[PDB]
Amino acid sequence: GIRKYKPTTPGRRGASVSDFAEITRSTPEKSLVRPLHGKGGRNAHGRITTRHKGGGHKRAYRVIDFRRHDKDGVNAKVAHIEYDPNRTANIALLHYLDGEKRYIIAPQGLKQGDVIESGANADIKPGNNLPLRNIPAGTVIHAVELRPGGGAKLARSAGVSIQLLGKEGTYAALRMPSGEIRRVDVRCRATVGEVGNAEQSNINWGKAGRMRWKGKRPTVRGVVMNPVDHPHGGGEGKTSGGRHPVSPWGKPEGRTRKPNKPSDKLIVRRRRTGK
RNA sequence: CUGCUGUGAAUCUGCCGGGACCACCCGGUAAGCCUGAAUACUUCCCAGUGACCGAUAGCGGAUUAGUACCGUGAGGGAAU
RNA sequence: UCUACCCAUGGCCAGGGUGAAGCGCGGGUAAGACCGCGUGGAGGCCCGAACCCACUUAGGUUGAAGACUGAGGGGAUGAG
RNA sequence: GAGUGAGAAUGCAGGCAUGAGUAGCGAUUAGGCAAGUGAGAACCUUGCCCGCCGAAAGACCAAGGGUUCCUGGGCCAGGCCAGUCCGCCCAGGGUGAGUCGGGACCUAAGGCGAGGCCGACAGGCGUAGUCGAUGGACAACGGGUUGAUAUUCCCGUACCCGUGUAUGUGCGUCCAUGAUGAAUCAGCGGUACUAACCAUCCAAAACCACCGUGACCGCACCUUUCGGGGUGUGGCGUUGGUGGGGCUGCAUGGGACCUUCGUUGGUAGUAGUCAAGCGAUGGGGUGACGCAGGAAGGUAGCCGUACCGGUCAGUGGUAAUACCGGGGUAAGCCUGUAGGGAGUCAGAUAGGUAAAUCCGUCUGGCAUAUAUCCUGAGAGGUGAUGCAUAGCCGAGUGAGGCGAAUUCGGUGAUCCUAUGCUGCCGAGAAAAGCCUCUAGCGAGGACAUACACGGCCCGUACCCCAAACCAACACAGGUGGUCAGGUAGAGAAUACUAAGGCGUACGAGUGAACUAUGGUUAAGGAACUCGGCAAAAUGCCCCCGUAACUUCGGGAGAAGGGGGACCCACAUGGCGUGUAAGCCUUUACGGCCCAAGCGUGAGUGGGUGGCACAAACCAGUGAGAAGCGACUGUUUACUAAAAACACAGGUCCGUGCGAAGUCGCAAGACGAUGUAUACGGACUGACGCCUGCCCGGUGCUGGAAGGUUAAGAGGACCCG
RNA sequence: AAUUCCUUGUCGGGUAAGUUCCGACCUGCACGAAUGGCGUAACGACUUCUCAACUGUCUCAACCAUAGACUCGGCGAAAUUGCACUACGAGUAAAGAUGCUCGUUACGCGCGGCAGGACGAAAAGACCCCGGGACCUUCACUACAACUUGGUAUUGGUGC
RNA sequence: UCUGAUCGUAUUGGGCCUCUAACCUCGGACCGUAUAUCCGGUUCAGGGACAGUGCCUGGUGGGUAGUUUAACUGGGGCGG
Ligand SMILES: [Mg+2]
Ligand SMILES: [Mg+2]
Ligand SMILES: [Mg+2]
Ligand SMILES: [Mg+2]
Ligand SMILES: [Mg+2]
Ligand SMILES: [Mg+2]
Ligand SMILES: [Mg+2]
Ligand SMILES: [Mg+2]
Ligand SMILES: [Mg+2]
Ligand SMILES: [Mg+2]
Ligand SMILES: [Mg+2]
Ligand SMILES: [Mg+2]
Ligand SMILES: [Mg+2]
Ligand SMILES: [Mg+2]
Ligand SMILES: [Mg+2]
Ligand SMILES: [Mg+2]
Ligand SMILES: [Mg+2]
Ligand SMILES: [Mg+2]
Ligand SMILES: [Mg+2]
Ligand SMILES: [Mg+2]
Ligand SMILES: [Mg+2]
Ligand SMILES: [Mg+2]
Ligand SMILES: [Mg+2]
Ligand SMILES: [Mg+2]
Ligand SMILES: [Mg+2]
Ligand SMILES: [Mg+2]
Ligand SMILES: [Mg+2]
Ligand SMILES: [Mg+2]
Ligand SMILES: [Mg+2]
Ligand SMILES: [Mg+2]
Ligand SMILES: [Mg+2]
Ligand SMILES: [Mg+2]
Ligand SMILES: [Mg+2]
Ligand SMILES: [Mg+2]
Ligand SMILES: [Mg+2]
Ligand SMILES: [Mg+2]
Ligand SMILES: [Mg+2]
Ligand SMILES: [Mg+2]
Ligand SMILES: [Mg+2]
Ligand SMILES: [Mg+2]
Ligand SMILES: [Mg+2]
Ligand SMILES: [Mg+2]
Ligand SMILES: [Mg+2]
Ligand SMILES: [Mg+2]
Ligand SMILES: [Mg+2]
Ligand SMILES: [Mg+2]
Ligand SMILES: [Mg+2]
Ligand SMILES: [Mg+2]
Ligand SMILES: [Mg+2]
Ligand SMILES: [Mg+2]
Ligand SMILES: [Mg+2]
Ligand SMILES: [Mg+2]
Ligand SMILES: [Mg+2]
Ligand SMILES: [Mg+2]
Ligand SMILES: [Mg+2]
Ligand SMILES: [Mg+2]
Ligand SMILES: [Mg+2]
Ligand SMILES: [Mg+2]
Ligand SMILES: [Mg+2]
Ligand SMILES: [Mg+2]
Ligand SMILES: [Mg+2]
Ligand SMILES: [Mg+2]
Ligand SMILES: [Mg+2]
Ligand SMILES: [Mg+2]
Ligand SMILES: [Mg+2]
Ligand SMILES: [Mg+2]
Ligand SMILES: [Mg+2]
Ligand SMILES: [Mg+2]
Ligand SMILES: [Mg+2]
Ligand SMILES: [Mg+2]
Ligand SMILES: [Mg+2]
Ligand SMILES: [Mg+2]
Ligand SMILES: [Mg+2]
Ligand SMILES: [Mg+2]
Ligand SMILES: [Mg+2]
Ligand SMILES: [Mg+2]
Ligand SMILES: [Mg+2]
Ligand SMILES: [Mg+2]
Ligand SMILES: [Mg+2]
Ligand SMILES: [Mg+2]
Ligand SMILES: [Mg+2]
Ligand SMILES: [Mg+2]
Ligand SMILES: [Mg+2]
Ligand SMILES: [Mg+2]
Ligand SMILES: [Mg+2]
Ligand SMILES: [Mg+2]
Ligand SMILES: [Mg+2]
Ligand SMILES: [Mg+2]
Ligand SMILES: [Mg+2]
Ligand SMILES: [Mg+2]
Ligand SMILES: [Mg+2]
Ligand SMILES: [Mg+2]
Ligand SMILES: [Mg+2]
Ligand SMILES: [Mg+2]
Ligand SMILES: [Mg+2]
Ligand SMILES: [Mg+2]
Ligand SMILES: [Mg+2]
Ligand SMILES: [Mg+2]
Ligand SMILES: [Mg+2]
Ligand SMILES: [Mg+2]
Ligand SMILES: [Mg+2]
Ligand SMILES: [Mg+2]
Ligand SMILES: [Mg+2]
Ligand SMILES: [Mg+2]
Ligand SMILES: [Mg+2]
Ligand SMILES: [Mg+2]
Ligand SMILES: [Mg+2]
Ligand SMILES: [Mg+2]
Ligand SMILES: [Mg+2]
Ligand SMILES: [Mg+2]
Ligand SMILES: [Mg+2]
Ligand SMILES: [Mg+2]
Ligand SMILES: [Mg+2]
Ligand SMILES: [Mg+2]
Ligand SMILES: [Mg+2]
Ligand SMILES: [Mg+2]
Ligand SMILES: [Mg+2]
Ligand SMILES: [Mg+2]
Ligand SMILES: [Mg+2]
Ligand SMILES: [Mg+2]
Ligand SMILES: [Mg+2]
Ligand SMILES: [Mg+2]
Ligand SMILES: [Mg+2]
Ligand SMILES: [Mg+2]
Ligand SMILES: [Mg+2]
Ligand SMILES: [Mg+2]
Ligand SMILES: [Mg+2]
Ligand SMILES: [Mg+2]
Ligand SMILES: [Mg+2]
Ligand SMILES: [Mg+2]
Ligand SMILES: [Mg+2]
Ligand SMILES: [Mg+2]
Ligand SMILES: [Mg+2]
Ligand SMILES: [Mg+2]
Ligand SMILES: [Mg+2]
Ligand SMILES: [Mg+2]
Ligand SMILES: [Mg+2]
Ligand SMILES: [Mg+2]
Ligand SMILES: [Mg+2]
Ligand SMILES: [Mg+2]
Ligand SMILES: [Mg+2]
Ligand SMILES: [Mg+2]
Ligand SMILES: [Mg+2]
Ligand SMILES: [Mg+2]
Ligand SMILES: [Mg+2]
Ligand SMILES: [Mg+2]
Ligand SMILES: [Mg+2]
Numbered sequence A: 001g002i003r004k005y006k007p008t009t010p011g012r013r014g015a016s017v018s019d020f021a022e023i024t025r026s027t028p029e030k031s032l033v034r035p036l037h038g039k040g041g042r043n044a045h046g047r048i049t050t051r052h053k054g055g056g057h058k059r060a061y062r063v064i065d066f067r068r069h070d071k072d073g074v075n076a077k078v079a080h081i082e083y084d085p086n087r088t089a090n091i092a093l094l095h096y097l098d099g100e101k102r103y104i105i106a107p108q109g110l111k112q113g114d115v116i117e118s119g120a121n122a123d124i125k126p127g128n129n130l131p132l133r134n135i136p137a138g139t140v141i142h143a144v145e146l147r148p149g150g151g152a153k154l155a156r157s158a159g160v161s162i163q164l165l166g167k168e169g170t171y172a173a174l175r176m177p178s179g180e181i182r183r184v185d186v187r188c189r190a191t192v193g194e195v196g197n198a199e200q201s202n203i204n205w206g207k208a209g210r211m212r213w214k215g216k217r218p219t220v221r222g223v224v225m226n227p228v229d230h231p232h233g234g235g236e237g238k239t240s241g242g243r244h245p246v247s248p249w250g251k252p253e254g255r256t257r258k259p260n261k262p263s264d265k266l267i268v269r270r271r272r273t274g275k
Numbered sequence B: 001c002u003g004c005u006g007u008g009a010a011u012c013u014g015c016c017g018g019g020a021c022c023a024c025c026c027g028g029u030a031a032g033c034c035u036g037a038a039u040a041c042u043u044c045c046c047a048g049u050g051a052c053c054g055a056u057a058g059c060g061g062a063u064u065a066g067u068a069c070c071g072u073g074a075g076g077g078a079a080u
Numbered sequence C: 001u002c003u004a005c006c007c008a009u010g011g012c013c014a015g016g017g018u019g020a021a022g023c024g025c026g027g028g029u030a031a032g033a034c035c036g037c038g039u040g041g042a043g044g045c046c047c048g049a050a051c052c053c054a055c056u057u058a059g060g061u062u063g064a065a066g067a068c069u070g071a072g073g074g075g076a077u078g079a080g
Numbered sequence D: 001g002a003g004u005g006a007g008a009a010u011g012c013a014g015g016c017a018u019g020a021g022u023a024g025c026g027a028u029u030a031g032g033c034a035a036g037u038g039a040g041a042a043c044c045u046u047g048c049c050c051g052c053c054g055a056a057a058g059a060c061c062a063a064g065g066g067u068u069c070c071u072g073g074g075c076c077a078g079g080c081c082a083g084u085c086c087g088c089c090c091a092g093g094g095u096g097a098g099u100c101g102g103g104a105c106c107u108a109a110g111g112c113g114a115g116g117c118c119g120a121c122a123g124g125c126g127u128a129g130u131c132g133a134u135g136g137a138c139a140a141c142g143g144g145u146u147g148a149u150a151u152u153c154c155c156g157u158a159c160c161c162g163u164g165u166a167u168g169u170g171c172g173u174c175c176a177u178g179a180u181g182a183a184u185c186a187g188c189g190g191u192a193c194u195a196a197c198c199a200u201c202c203a204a205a206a207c208c209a210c211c212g213u214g215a216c217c218g219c220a221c222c223u224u225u226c227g228g229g230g231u232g233u234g235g236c237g238u239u240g241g242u243g244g245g246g247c248u249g250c251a252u253g254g255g256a257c258c259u260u261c262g263u264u265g266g267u268a269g270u271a272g273u274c275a276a277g278c279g280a281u282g283g284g285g286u287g288a289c290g291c292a293g294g295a296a297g298g299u300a301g302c303c304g305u306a307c308c309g310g311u312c313a314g315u316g317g318u319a320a321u322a323c324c325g326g327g328g329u330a331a332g333c334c335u336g337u338a339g340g341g342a343g344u345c346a347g348a349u350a351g352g353u354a355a356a357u358c359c360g361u362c363u364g365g366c367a368u369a370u371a372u373c374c375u376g377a378g379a380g381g382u383g384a385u386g387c388a389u390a391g392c393c394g395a396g397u398g399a400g401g402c403g404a405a406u407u408c409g410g411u412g413a414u415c416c417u418a419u420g421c422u423g424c425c426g427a428g429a430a431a432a433g434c435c436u437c438u439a440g441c442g443a444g445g446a447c448a449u450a451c452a453c454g455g456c457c458c459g460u461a462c463c464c465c466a467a468a469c470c471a472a473c474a475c476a477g478g479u480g481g482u483c484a485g486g487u488a489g490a491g492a493a494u495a496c497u498a499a500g501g502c503g504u505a506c507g508a509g510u511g512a513a514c515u516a517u518g519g520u521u522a523a524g525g526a527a528c529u530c531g532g533c534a535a536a537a538u539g540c541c542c543c544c545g546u547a548a549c550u551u552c553g554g555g556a557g558a559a560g561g562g563g564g565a566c567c568c569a570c571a572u573g574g575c576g577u578g579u580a581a582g583c584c585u586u587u588a589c590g591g592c593c594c595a596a597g598c599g600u601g602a603g604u605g606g607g608u609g610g611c612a613c614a615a616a617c618c619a620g621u622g623a624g625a626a627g628c629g630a631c632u633g634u635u636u637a638c639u640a641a642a643a644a645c646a647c648a649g650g651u652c653c654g655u656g657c658g659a660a661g662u663c664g665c666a667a668g669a670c671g672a673u674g675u676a677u678a679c680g681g682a683c684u685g686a687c688g689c690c691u692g693c694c695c696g697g698u699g700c701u702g703g704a705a706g707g708u709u710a711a712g713a714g715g716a717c718c719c720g
Numbered sequence E: 001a002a003u004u005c006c007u008u009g010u011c012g013g014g015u016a017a018g019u020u021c022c023g024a025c026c027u028g029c030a031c032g033a034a035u036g037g038c039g040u041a042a043c044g045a046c047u048u049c050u051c052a053a054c055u056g057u058c059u060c061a062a063c064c065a066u067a068g069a070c071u072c073g074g075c076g077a078a079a080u081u082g083c084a085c086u087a088c089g090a091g092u093a094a095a096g097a098u099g100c101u102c103g104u105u106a107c108g109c110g111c112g113g114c115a116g117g118a119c120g121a122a123a124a125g126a127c128c129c130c131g132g133g134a135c136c137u138u139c140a141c142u143a144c145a146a147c148u149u150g151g152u153a154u155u156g157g158u159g160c
Numbered sequence F: 001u002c003u004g005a006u007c008g009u010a011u012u013g014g015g016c017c018u019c020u021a022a023c024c025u026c027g028g029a030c031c032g033u034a035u036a037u038c039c040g041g042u043u044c045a046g047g048g049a050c051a052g053u054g055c056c057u058g059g060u061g062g063g064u065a066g067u068u069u070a071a072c073u074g075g076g077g078c079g080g
Helices: A208-213
Strands: A001-006 A016-018 A075-083 A090-096 A101-103 A115-117 A129-131 A138-141 A161-169 A171-175 A181-186 A189-192 A267-269
Touching: none
Parallel strands: none
Antiparallel strands: A001 A016, A075 A090, A075 A115, A090 A101, A129 A189, A138 A161, A138 A189, A161 A171, A171 A181, A181 A267
16 A cells, blocks of 8 residues: 655655555565666667666566466466566466466455466456456456467556457457557457556655666756757746757657558547547 | 669561651661770889989988887877 | 766775654553553664765965865765 | 078977076975995984874785896986985896686676678678676685795695595396386276157248238229229238147257277286486576664684793882783684574375476375474684794804793674574576486496595786876876774774884075964954955763744754862672572583672762863854755866756656657667556646636647649640 | 846835845836746755854954075076167157157166066957858758658459 | 430449458467577468558658858947
8 A cells, every 4th residue: 555654854755655565475486587687778779769767776577477378277376466676566476286386467356365267267256367258348357468369468557457348240349548449359368357556656756866766867858958959958048948849859749659550440549638 | 875663565668876856868787795906003023214312301211110209099200 | 998877796884873664561442543651773864984075265376286285164874 | 404592481400598507306204323334425224312104104915017026236327416325227036826816617787699680882780609707606724934936835734626546345237126017808887870769949831810901803982074083891812910729840958779988807917117326408496696774692803810931221219019021823624502594204296398206286194392404603622742932042144942831801893603684665697506306328336445646727026095007207196905903082083102114315504574384462353354255263971951933753962051180988889791609400512690800880978189170182153034946966077066957746748569759771679578557758846825818820639611732644736 | 026227216124324134115117827926844065134152354463483485505497588788857759768859867796675667478369340160040041861642563353 | 326315245544342362460389499589481360452662743841951141331230
């Protein structure tokens, strides 16, 4: 949940931290972890393609299974629920009966010791993973694939879920987290439930340092820079830029979705803004 | 005459040239290939010549010279 | 090889204070809220060396120095 | 025929004046004397004093340098003066490793990159690879020696890899020993072709009743004069629909013949299969990890002391009572304590890119013990009849020789247990290595002792917070790591000092002005000045006492005020420590208590002295109000540190996933090993209260009715 | 008012006396709501004003010590430089004279001091102008990358 | 044959619907391969004559680039 600090110092004052209430264990599986390093927002040319990234507290990658297909009718019990740097949600550590350990994105209402079965025959209880064709229309699902066997892609993040609106032919129509309605192939798997840590968003970081640890460097505002740097720059005084707002690279505001994309044939409407 | 993109022919009353283009004359025979000599040049060696220099000149360099020395480096660069 | 940011891997940070959550004991109640006292040892917390800066001032100003020196000054478990 | 004429280009090269025998001669330590050498001495050698550093200006290294090191010479250049001296010049010498730092071991970021993809060409990325320590793994310590090296040589004692022989154990295949095992035929039940059996579903062909009537027939009524035409009914035909009854097929479920599979009689525990040791390039464990924080248990060091050796320091007092100097010794091998860590046997199972007795998971049983096992500080033993040492001898640069005691306490680490434990959230490298598991090799091979051997390449001198490196200089600057004595003190601050090291390269004088850097000051006390700039002041410990306002934490060390030296008494006390004794035992590296001994405050009472008792050094100025920025941060290296930038928070716009966005001609990359509670962009900037009106202008978003509009189609007309 | 030209606006407070400061007034030259508006505890080597304490900052200076300066010994530079046995006054002149005129004053040579002049030294004025650059802006001109429109090639079949 | 209305057989463009065989897939699974998230191949599942890429063409285009931006003037600007 949210544990709020007492203002014992000006930094800590508004701030809050996640009460980690769902954490059974502090120490990830030595098998399922890969090493990882920060790129600091620089590509293979070493240039900065993505500004504002860097700093950061060194972190190791847990290998999540988004791919779950293999195990069928093999029931797993949830061993621990532990904490993952790389993503917003938690991760459940499953033990199959096969004696194979896997991580999954921890669903909502998943408690330690539960049973979870993936396959066709499975129940519509939380945590279970089944192809969209076997799911009663109108449920709430998450970690959804795109193509049949393309891994889980939609609705991974904390507190978030997809409503499955219906079924026609080989297309099942989903309402995305964004509020946008998109069609998809009924062969592709989904997981049943919402996603844990729905309080994630009310964490109030409270001091610059904290955001630094988490990896974000500071951001300089356009209007401040010289006109050589940024299009908004310049002026003697404070300015509003005196120009219609743009990126630092001069491209204006507006729709950036490139038209003609293939998937565009699937999409029923895009999200609506400020309605 | 020639590049790329399209369209796309005829085999000798054929086809291409004769400064848009058309006729008549003349010339030639595309879309296959080789080919010496006459012409250009001197890192390098031999033999010379000079109304060229003669040591602040002549090569940056007659003396340890691309050395000493300067510069992270590309590079610069003496004096006797 | 200076400097700006990043990445990997190491090291450093005398000494002193303050006393967060949590936990415990007693109170308080129907059970709470809540109130003492204990542990406990949080923090871009406080005082202050190493260290990192460079605020004021005096001197230097063909300098000891192509940017220093002396007095004081700021940060000093952290965006170090 | 001219490279033909110079006074001037802040002209170029060289030589030389003027300033001028002038400024300087490089800190914040400081030198003096006697003798010595020598042509010559403020500066060189020795001696005796004095002074300075002492978390350094001492000791040892990395980087960098490259002979600067040692001996013997030198003394025109160099050294800011001289010079016999030198870090300068000349000659010779000097660097010794199985273990220390690296390679032959391992990988991180990153580099390169066979094929490869992309790119007119040049090339851009990148897979397998292979490199790349600042990290991981891996075996040594004390003492002595030379003019110069030493964890390298030597002495003593270890450890780690390999190789050969010899000996003894115990195993092996051959022989055989255990364990098991499945295969076929033969006696049987439910899977299950196939004809049915049972139950139900449905309706072609449809039997019947009713209504609706393509059209036809027309009886009756209305209608225009009559027609057209509308209505009521029936005869039927069925573009038709509805309710009841049966046959046929169909599907499904249930038992059953075929078939098979499972079960058990014969064999065939016979022909099979495995088992000594090696064992992966394969599987699994481990390796393997943040930051903070103590508490605890230890030692190193230091301070005492039993004991040992010694001195009389021409002064008033002091012969042992006083004083000075000793009061040492490693790795390793034993031993396994404080601390910390751990459930274990049997069955099944294929999940672990084949197989696994291993690992995982599921079952079970058996365990709450100080049981067991691993780990591990230090105590103790050995190492050590040795080595070292305070001194004492004579010889004298020096050589060498002898060599006493070598107990018990206190204090105490930032070091060790500890890569531990406990919290916390920001969730904290890899690979080799070592341990195992089989695949696989295998007739031979393991284990111990003894003996004999092999142990490679590079660094190794000297400087290293500096006159030896970077700074053009023998330059007040810069440069990472390791050691850390004493008395005061909270302390690695400061003061004084040990060990050790220096006095550092111009001097000698002299009361000038003036300048700098320190010092003191009657009376007044900001009158100074742009401005209390600069000084002065405050300053420590322990008590007392503290306001407005407040986001309830702060403000606050607010302000303001008191005590502090020495001596005695309380006190043969209080607290810490802990020995003898005592008590207790599961008798051990035990526990409990502890007279003595050593250490140390705090306080109360009484004295004593001074101008002053935080006596030096060290060490907050405080209070009221306003603007700006919430805050810690950051910034114009070399005139600007702020009110600027950042910030946590806010709102908007974009982005549905090799996304948007950026880097690239592309491939590809980052975004992100993320997925709308996420990511990019823009403005605002903690918190509180709030955020009004305008869509004409110009942007963005959406929309096509028109109006305008390219190439492509179209070739009427016209011309040759 | 970090915004108010007129302006030291007007009043109150503080001072013996206040162009600054604090509090109001509103006649806002030319405030105003995320280029945010109005507040705000804590914080500031920020700016501004007042007070206590304390003082050589001052009335008004004095004395002392070191390091320079000064003397002697040794070494031994620099920037600068058309010349030279290089006065002053009133004038004159490219309009500010050591150097010209008329006068007045002054023995030769040093040494220590001070800074009025030498339009002193330094740096081919940074201000201003003119010419030339550069870099920045944009509904200046013209282009190009990027982004996009339709045609055509790669590109085919059956249907309406 | 003409003022004109039509069918069916041709030609030829326009829209629309589908299909699969070009083409596309950072979808799967095997193989090259002992080791490869590279790359290539086979196959499966999808898209599908669209998209992408050429050539032609119209836009948008301070994102970048080259440049221009007068003179007189009782200094220059403003004015004229
Ligand atoms: Mg590169
Ligand atoms: Mg960003
Ligand atoms: Mg998380
Ligand atoms: Mg947030
Ligand atoms: Mg905050
Ligand atoms: Mg910003
Ligand atoms: Mg700016
Ligand atoms: Mg720039
Ligand atoms: Mg711009
Ligand atoms: Mg600006
Ligand atoms: Mg402005
Ligand atoms: Mg704005
Ligand atoms: Mg602007
Ligand atoms: Mg949004
Ligand atoms: Mg040819
Ligand atoms: Mg020459
Ligand atoms: Mg000559
Ligand atoms: Mg060089
Ligand atoms: Mg406490
Ligand atoms: Mg408490
Ligand atoms: Mg702090
Ligand atoms: Mg502070
Ligand atoms: Mg200073
Ligand atoms: Mg001076
Ligand atoms: Mg200082
Ligand atoms: Mg300080
Ligand atoms: Mg201070
Ligand atoms: Mg401090
Ligand atoms: Mg000439
Ligand atoms: Mg001449
Ligand atoms: Mg000349
Ligand atoms: Mg000259
Ligand atoms: Mg001279
Ligand atoms: Mg002079
Ligand atoms: Mg003189
Ligand atoms: Mg002098
Ligand atoms: Mg000196
Ligand atoms: Mg000096
Ligand atoms: Mg003498
Ligand atoms: Mg000391
Ligand atoms: Mg070194
Ligand atoms: Mg000598
Ligand atoms: Mg000499
Ligand atoms: Mg000399
Ligand atoms: Mg020497
Ligand atoms: Mg030599
Ligand atoms: Mg490469
Ligand atoms: Mg190649
Ligand atoms: Mg290597
Ligand atoms: Mg290393
Ligand atoms: Mg030595
Ligand atoms: Mg040694
Ligand atoms: Mg790990
Ligand atoms: Mg831990
Ligand atoms: Mg201790
Ligand atoms: Mg006597
Ligand atoms: Mg003694
Ligand atoms: Mg097991
Ligand atoms: Mg021992
Ligand atoms: Mg620790
Ligand atoms: Mg050997
Ligand atoms: Mg060397
Ligand atoms: Mg050595
Ligand atoms: Mg050495
Ligand atoms: Mg030293
Ligand atoms: Mg220099
Ligand atoms: Mg040097
Ligand atoms: Mg020196
Ligand atoms: Mg130096
Ligand atoms: Mg340092
Ligand atoms: Mg000390
Ligand atoms: Mg000190
Ligand atoms: Mg001293
Ligand atoms: Mg000494
Ligand atoms: Mg004098
Ligand atoms: Mg004097
Ligand atoms: Mg003075
Ligand atoms: Mg006075
Ligand atoms: Mg007085
Ligand atoms: Mg006053
Ligand atoms: Mg005044
Ligand atoms: Mg005055
Ligand atoms: Mg004033
Ligand atoms: Mg001051
Ligand atoms: Mg003072
Ligand atoms: Mg208090
Ligand atoms: Mg006080
Ligand atoms: Mg206060
Ligand atoms: Mg005892
Ligand atoms: Mg007894
Ligand atoms: Mg007992
Ligand atoms: Mg008295
Ligand atoms: Mg203080
Ligand atoms: Mg106000
Ligand atoms: Mg600030
Ligand atoms: Mg604010
Ligand atoms: Mg800075
Ligand atoms: Mg500056
Ligand atoms: Mg500051
Ligand atoms: Mg400054
Ligand atoms: Mg800034
Ligand atoms: Mg806010
Ligand atoms: Mg923000
Ligand atoms: Mg934000
Ligand atoms: Mg993109
Ligand atoms: Mg906006
Ligand atoms: Mg702002
Ligand atoms: Mg509008
Ligand atoms: Mg509009
Ligand atoms: Mg409009
Ligand atoms: Mg509106
Ligand atoms: Mg539009
Ligand atoms: Mg046309
Ligand atoms: Mg004001
Ligand atoms: Mg006024
Ligand atoms: Mg007034
Ligand atoms: Mg006043
Ligand atoms: Mg006011
Ligand atoms: Mg205004
Ligand atoms: Mg508004
Ligand atoms: Mg606005
Ligand atoms: Mg603001
Ligand atoms: Mg305000
Ligand atoms: Mg305020
Ligand atoms: Mg600050
Ligand atoms: Mg400040
Ligand atoms: Mg003097
Ligand atoms: Mg002299
Ligand atoms: Mg000169
Ligand atoms: Mg005149
Ligand atoms: Mg005159
Ligand atoms: Mg005259
Ligand atoms: Mg004359
Ligand atoms: Mg004179
Ligand atoms: Mg003068
Ligand atoms: Mg002067
Ligand atoms: Mg002057
Ligand atoms: Mg000029
Ligand atoms: Mg100009
Ligand atoms: Mg196409
Ligand atoms: Mg196209
Ligand atoms: Mg543009
Ligand atoms: Mg431009
Ligand atoms: Mg041009
Ligand atoms: Mg003009
Ligand atoms: Mg004018
Ligand atoms: Mg004029």
